[PDB]
Amino acid sequence: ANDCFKAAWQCIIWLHQ
Amino acid sequence: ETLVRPKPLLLKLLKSVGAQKDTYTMKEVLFYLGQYIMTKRLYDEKQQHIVYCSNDLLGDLFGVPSFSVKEHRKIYTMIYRNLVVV
Amino acid sequence: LATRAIPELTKLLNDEDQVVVNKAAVMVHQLSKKEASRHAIMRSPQMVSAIVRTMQNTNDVETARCTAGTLHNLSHHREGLLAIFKSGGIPALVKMLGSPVDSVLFYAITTLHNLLLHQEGAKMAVRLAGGLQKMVALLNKTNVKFLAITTDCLQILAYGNQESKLIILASGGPQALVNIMRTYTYEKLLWTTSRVLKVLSVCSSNKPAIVEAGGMQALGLHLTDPSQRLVQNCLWTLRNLSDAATKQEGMEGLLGTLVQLLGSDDINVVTCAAGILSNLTCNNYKNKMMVCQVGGIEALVRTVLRAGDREDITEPAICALRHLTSRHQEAEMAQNAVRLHYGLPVVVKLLHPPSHWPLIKATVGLIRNLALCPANHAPLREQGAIPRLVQLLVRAHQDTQRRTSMGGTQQQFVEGVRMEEIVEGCTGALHILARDVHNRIVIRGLNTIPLFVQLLYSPIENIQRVAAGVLCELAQDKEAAEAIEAEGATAPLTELLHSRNEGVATYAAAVLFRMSED
Ligand SMILES: *CC(=O)Nc1ccc(NC(=O)C*)cc1
């Protein structure tokens, strides 16, 4: 209920900019 | 690296989760903002790749009532209008 | 004139009284002054065979000056050199390059210098007599013209003989030859010393030791000296000797000098100037800073404009631009100054023929750096970068797909480009250009998605990095997402999520994030 969100942002932060 | 100084209409968001500085790296802005959506509960816990912000601060900063998690560029550019880079 | 006294003098030098010998050689050097009596001594190998002995076996000074002075008076005449050589003088002259007095060296280092040029065999007998060791040891003399002869003798002996190039290195060579360029002002000596450093550079054994002592920083001092016979030799040295200079400073003035040489009317100078900058910017952080701070972009962009199709000029120039536009503080300006100085249109033209492949390998690598600053997304699409980058990507795949060859698949260089590199760069460049939405309609419209998927099986870990990344930058639009999810991608990506590098466990997981979800 809270993991599929966390693992998504720490992949959008992957790309920086 | 990269440093940006946000516009104060954005700072209210970061100043709500516990931010203390006045300038931030883009890693930090994408961190404090991700903590806001998680704390205030804006995702749709059904399928969680959607963020709601009808009558919230994001709904005023961004401009779109509902944006997806991985639309990248729009998010990247939606955050890039309330800041002034230094 | 007259002889009638040489046999009288032949034994008088061998007199065991070391005082009559001084009173004997006092006139031999005087009687050698005239051209007439000079021929008499040369025709008497019994006479010269005593002068050599009196040199390598004397305790006086006037004897050593009169003897070695006589041998100099013979060097101007032809058959007077063979007598010195057939009397075994070379092992004796090389000795006096040790005894400390200036009057004999101008007489000895010259008698060797003429013997090195105007008589054969000496270039070998000197190396055996240990001449290079005694010659380098006398590089600290306060005289300058004496060093012009000494350094020139080193150029004759070390020319094309890596036995001699290794001897000068072992006996402390480069560290001393730099303190000759860095100090004196005589053009003839600096022309010779630089002429020596070059034939020490091509041997990849002296290349660091010249850099380590301080060769580059000192050779750039004289880049503004008028005599062009000295200028290009210094540039020729650095070009061969910049391979191992990537990790030291002090070049602050050296980089603010080669940039100005790019606007020279001498093509052979710019070629030897951009190649230096191409090697001196491959790994250093602050070297790229200094180039962008002297206006290095505008001056280097203009070079390619007037170079035209001369790839020998554009090949290092594009590589130099690729370095400045990546991974340093002045990045956002280096990628912007190419636009503001009208460099974007010509760079795209280099993608098209008749440009060969090694230059294109560097140009398709420049686009991925030029596309970081988003102000260059529109101009690249306007100049036809997407439909041309796809073309080069198509052949590169439709040429390495010739795995059907001989039992083991022959992979063919010769041209210099490993054809897996063009795929490694083009799909790496499109991964950056596919951020602007208008590109994502062109890249989609060019019917390219069912091609990235076949690349996604390539065992190269740099193909998967960019192929499974350029698809992530296409996965935003649903018009392209659920289309990817049909033409493969559902299964080959399923177990890219356990490959080693954490840059492929992601990306390949970022594509699956949006596809067959809800
Ligand atoms: C349920 C879940 O966590 N899915 C998911 C989302 C994102 C990622 N990471 C990236 O996409 C980079 C993994 C799994």
Author numbering:
A (entry chain C): 5 to 21
B (entry chain B): 25 to 110
C (entry chain A): 148 to 665
The article reads:
Here, we report a general and rapid method for discovering α-helically constrained (Helicon) polypeptides that cooperatively induce the interaction between two target proteins without relying on previously known binders or an intrinsic affinity between the proteins. We show that Helicons are capable of binding every major class of E3 ubiquitin ligases, which are of great biological and therapeutic interest but remain largely intractable to targeting by small molecules. In addition to possessing increased stability and membrane permeability, Helicons are capable of binding large, flat protein surfaces that are inaccessible to targeting by small molecules, and Helicons have been developed to target a range of PPI targets in cells and in vivo.
This screen identified hits belonging to multiple clusters, including C91-C93, that bound β-catenin only in the presence of MDM2. Finally, we performed x-ray crystallography to characterize the MDM2-β-catenin complexes induced by trimerizers H329 and H330 from C91 and H332 and H333 from C92. The calculated electron density maps indicated that residues 6–21 of H330 and residues 5–21 of H332 were well-resolved. Gratifyingly, all four structures confirmed Helicon-mediated ternary complex formation, with the Helicons bridging the p53-binding site of MDM2 and the C-terminal ICAT-binding site of β-catenin. Similar to the H330-mediated ternary complex, the 3.9 Å ternary structure between MDM2, Helicon H332, and β-catenin again involved Helicon residues Phe9, Trp13, and Ile16 for interacting with MDM2, but revealed a distinct solution for MDM2-Helicon-binding to β-catenin, with notable differences at the β-catenin-binding interface. Specifically, the H332 β-catenin interaction is driven by the C-terminal hydrophobic tail residues of the Helicon, Trp18, and Ile19, engaging β-catenin residues including Tyr654. We also observed several Helicon-driven hydrogen bonds and salt bridges between MDM2 and β-catenin, including Gln71 and His73 of MDM2 interacting with Glu664 of β-catenin, and His96 of MDM2 interacting with Gln623 of β-catenin. Finally, Phe660 of β-catenin is positioned in a hydrophobic pocket surrounded by His73 of MDM2 and the staple residue of H332.
